[PDB]
Amino acid sequence: EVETFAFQAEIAQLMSLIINTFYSNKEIFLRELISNSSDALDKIRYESLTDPSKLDSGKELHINLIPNKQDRTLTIVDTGIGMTKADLINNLGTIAKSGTKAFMEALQAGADISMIGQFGVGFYSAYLVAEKVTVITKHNDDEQYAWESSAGGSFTVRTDTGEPMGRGTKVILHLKEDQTEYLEERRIKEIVKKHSQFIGYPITLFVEKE
Ligand SMILES: Nc1ncnc2[nH]cnc12
């Protein structure tokens, strides 16, 4: 069964802004998603310090980037703490209602969209480049779920039947037709080196068969 939910009004407004504003520096989406993955890896590492069985679901802590030119998707995979169903419904573990309010006030007081991550809602920068986003996630305390939204006011949550993950989060970006530069190896390397050089977990960029 699929459950369909309405976004809180502030999040729907944030997403409409991101989608319709003219803003050329779109590459920041990848820095923000990597930063979210890094934070999730830090959390499971911290919990494992006093309970090593938390890593029974996978001891490797890393971030993978998987482009797929056939599907026009870019997938960011981490082995971090993951999300329970309640985390997914509550704006993917963020304080997005309050963070959106602070961000929009900041945009009036001389901030630009690249500061989105300072307000805790960096995930939504994915919609600079994606028409649809799928999040697959597995937390130690819950089942594997899939979240999906094409914006437009609603999101869905279902139990995921795909390949098991062990623990972590996969963010699947269904890219807009004019944003395929983010599938190119050389463009992804440029972004990671510019914005994410000092992330403290290994980032592997997968290659494609062609
Ligand atoms: N990668 C991620 N891990 C856990 N919670 C998240 N919320 C948004 N992205 C996340």
Swiss-Prot record:
The keyword Ubl conjugation applies. It comes from the Eukaryota. Its main location: nucleus. Molecular chaperone that promotes the maturation, structural maintenance and proper regulation of specific target proteins involved for instance in cell cycle control and signal transduction. Undergoes a functional cycle that is linked to its ATPase activity which is essential for its chaperone activity. This cycle probably induces conformational changes in the client proteins, thereby causing their activation. Interacts dynamically with various co-chaperones that modulate its substrate recognition, ATPase cycle and chaperone function. Homodimer. Identified in NR3C1/GCR steroid receptor-chaperone complexes formed at least by NR3C1, HSP90AA1 and a variety of proteins containing TPR repeats such as FKBP4, FKBP5, PPID, PPP5C or STIP1. Forms a complex containing HSP90AA1, TSC1 and TSC2; TSC1 is required to recruit TCS2 to the complex. The closed form interacts (via the middle domain and TPR repeat-binding motif) with co-chaperone TSC1 (via C-terminus). Interacts with TOM34. Interacts with TERT; the interaction, together with PTGES3, is required for correct assembly and stabilization of the TERT holoenzyme complex. Belongs to the heat shock protein 90 family. This is Heat shock protein HSP 90-alpha. It comes from Homo sapiens. The chain holds residues 16 to 225 of 732 of the full protein.
